[PDB]
């Protein structure tokens, strides 16, 4: 029996866009409904 990791963003999630050094937050978001362009 092997151990594996699967990640599926198939329900509401958070996305935080951050600066590499300070981790200051440029953008904060929650996707409850992924509307299309």
């Amino acid at each position: 029996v092997e151990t594996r990791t699967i990640v599926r963003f198939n329900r509401p999630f958070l996305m935080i866009i951050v600066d590499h050094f300070t981790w200051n937050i440029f953008f904060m978001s929650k996707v409850t409904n992924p509307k299309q362009a």
């Binding site: 990640v7 329900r11 509401p12 951050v18 440029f26 953008f27 904060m28 409904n33 509307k35």
Partner: protein
């Protein structure tokens, strides 16, 4: 040591947004809003000033005014990078009523600390002043934020504007050949079919937060920026939101470790929101600035200015090659 204040402000504002409409998409730039209010605070005194600075979550027993503004000055210097690899720009502007003489200290501080542009505007023609400001924001956001200002009172004396623009490539981009339609569950019962991008056999920073019932992964951009994704277990979103604190972000950062992930699936999406932030800023303790007791006499020397509205608009676009995001904030200041 002051990024924690901006993170505190970001999460405190987030929670207020979600309390008013728990099921809507959220997108905003806390850094844009913080910068605009710090810019405004250059003209504030007494209770108006301390409420703004504490509302931005700075600790005034440990940090001086000068240190606060310098931290925004330093941030602005770094958030202006440009290459096909990563574009990040931020700008500040003041739109000043025609004939209105500003204090030398305010003008000099704004230029030195916020790098601000200034424009004389005839606010009596509100449609023209609106066009002027909206075109300025459209240019600064490369067409992404249009109609930041939906209306202006003809009694407006000054508008402070901040915009941010971000365009980045993934360090590990998705291949559209492997983007396929599958279900995204809005709730345990309701689903929508969306294009799910995928990556395989990848090693990225990963943390399963068993205590907070969520999974955290970091997807880097090419350049000095990263995306942190947090996936709450079903029905745990509201509690994960309550745990959004600077200490939680720090703990996540300390706990991420490279891990081999067999499959990762992320939807393509493009969202947009606009806000009137008056009520939320009032909840965070910013009150006198909006009233006849406002003390903004540091702008012209006259205590006859109050904040009428603070508005914000932001957009987020996520796709196989990278991400495009932008936002802008306007602080409308009217005559008392």
């Amino acid at each position: 040591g002051l990024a924690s204040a901006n993170v505190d402000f970001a999460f405190s504002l987030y929670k207020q947004l979600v309390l008013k409409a728990p099921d809507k998409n959220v997108i905003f730039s806390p850094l844009s809003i913080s910068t605009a209010l710090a810019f405004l605070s250059l003209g504030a005194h007494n209770t108006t000033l301390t409420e703004i600075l504490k509302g931005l979550k700075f600790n005034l027993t440990e940090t001086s005014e000068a240190e606060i503004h310098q931290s925004f000055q330093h941030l602005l210097r770094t958030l202006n990078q440009s290459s096909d690899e990563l574009q990040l720009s931020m700008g500040n502007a003041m739109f000043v009523k025609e004939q209105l003489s500003l204090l030398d200290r305010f003008t000099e501080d704004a230029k030195r600390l916020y790098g601000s542009e200034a424009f004389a505007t005839d606010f009596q023609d509100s449609a023209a002043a609106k066009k002027l400001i909206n075109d300025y924001v459209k240019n600064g956001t490369r067409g992404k934020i249009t109609d930041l200002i939906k209306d202006l009172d003809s009694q407006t004396m000054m508008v402070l504007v901040n915009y941010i623009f971000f365009k980045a490539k993934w360090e590990m981009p998705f291949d559209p050949q492997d983007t396929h339609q599958s279900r995204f569950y809005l709730s345990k019962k309701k689903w929508v079919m969306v294009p799910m991008m995928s990556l395989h056999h990848l090693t990225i920073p990963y943390f399963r937060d068993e205590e907070l019932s969520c999974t955290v992964v970091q997807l880097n951009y090419t350049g000095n920026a990263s995306a942190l994704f947090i996936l709450p277990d079903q029905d745990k979103m509201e509690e994960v939101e309550a745990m959004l604190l600077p200490e939680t972000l720090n703990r996540w950062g300390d706990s991420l470790e490279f891990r081999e992930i067999g499959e990762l699936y992320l939807p393509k999406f493009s969202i947009s929101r606009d806000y009137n932030l008056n009520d939320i800023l009032l909840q965070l303790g910013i009150e006198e600035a909006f009233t006849s007791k406002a003390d903004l006499s540091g702008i012209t020397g006259a205590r006859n200015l109050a904040v009428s509205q603070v508005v914000h608009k932001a957009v987020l676009d996520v796709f196989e090659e990278g991400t495009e995001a932008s936002a802008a904030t306007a602080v409308k200041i009217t005559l008392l």
